[PDB]
Design a protein around this ligand. Structure first.
Ligand SMILES: O=S(=O)(Nc1ccccn1)c1ccc(/N=C/c2c(O)[nH]c3ccc4ncsc4c23)cc1
Length: 247
């Protein structure tokens, strides 16, 4: 084994927080002092080589079935649930952009570490205290055409999903391509269809999404660009922003 292995006895699963397939997620205490999250799996790790403030941190692992993966605890759960919850209705464009910046900053690290996530979506972003967001869990509606058809997943197919994730943020959690089943989405997107600008969303934020959805993967911006554009959005791109009714 490796230095990531711990004894199961050192773990204390208390509350169940997630009903999942091929597993479940539990909250608990580690070494009696640390609050942790434990993901159990039912009958390799890129999470060991990756470390960043905007990626959910691995703490330890029981590699003997029952398998337990111990990670840092994110107190508000999934970004999708957070957006569709009681507070999401109060999120305005400034908090939504800042959340996008944290995800972009996590993805920039993945990018310069030369890895690919393959399933970037609000469901896989975890929220913590203080609107902290972290990427986790390293689906056609979020997958780039070349990836969903030919299995060509690169950092640039993640950039595509990042754009869809922006539509999730600016709609407060709505599903992409409303009213469309998977087959019509793939058929229309191949013919050049792109989701329009969500209501009350500035055109400059939609312009960024369209950049993420360019057919040519190399023409799509990097996460480093995306991070800087969004961190600086209200000064350099939309200095005259004014809160509207629902954003
Ligand atoms: O309050 S809740 O809304 N629901 C509930 C449900 C039951 C009791 C109380 N509350 C919530 C949901 C998830 C959550 N956190 C989960 C994770 C975490 O803390 N670290 C993780 C690392 C990986 C990972 N992969 C799938 S989940 C997950 C998590 C925290 C609170």
């Amino acid at each position: 084994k490796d230095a990531w292995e711990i004894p199961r006895e050192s773990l204390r699963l208390e509350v169940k927080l997630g009903q999942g397939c091929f597993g479940e997620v539990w909250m608990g205490t580690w070494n009696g002092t640390t609050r942790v999250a434990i993901k159990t799996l039912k009958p390799a790790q890129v999470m060991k080589k990756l470390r960043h403030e905007k990626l959910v941190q691995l703490y330890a692992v029981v590699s003997e079935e029952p398998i337990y993966i111990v990670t840092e605890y994110m107190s508000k759960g999934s970004l999708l649930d957070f957006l569709k919850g009681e507070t999401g209705k109060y999120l305005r464009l400034p908090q939504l952009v800042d959340m996008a910046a944290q995800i972009a900053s996590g993805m920039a690290y993945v990018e310069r570490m030369n890895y690919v996530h393959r399933d970037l979506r609000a469901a896989n972003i975890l929220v913590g205290e203080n609107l902290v967001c972290k990427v986790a869990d390293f689906p056609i509606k979020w997958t780039a055409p070349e990836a969903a058809l030919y299995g060509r997943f690169t950092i640039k197919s993640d950039v595509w999903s990042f754009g869809i994730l922006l539509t999730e943020l600016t709609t407060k959690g709505r599903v992409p391509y409303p009213g469309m089943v998977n087959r019509e989405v793939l058929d229309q997107v191949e013919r050049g269809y792109r989701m329009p600008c969500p209501p009350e969303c500035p055109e400059s934020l939609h312009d960024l999404m369209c950049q993420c959805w360019r057919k040519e993967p190399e023409e799509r911006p990097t996460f480093e660009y995306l991070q800087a554009f969004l961190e600086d959005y209200f000064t350099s791109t939309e200095p005259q922003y004014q809160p509207g009714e629902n954003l």
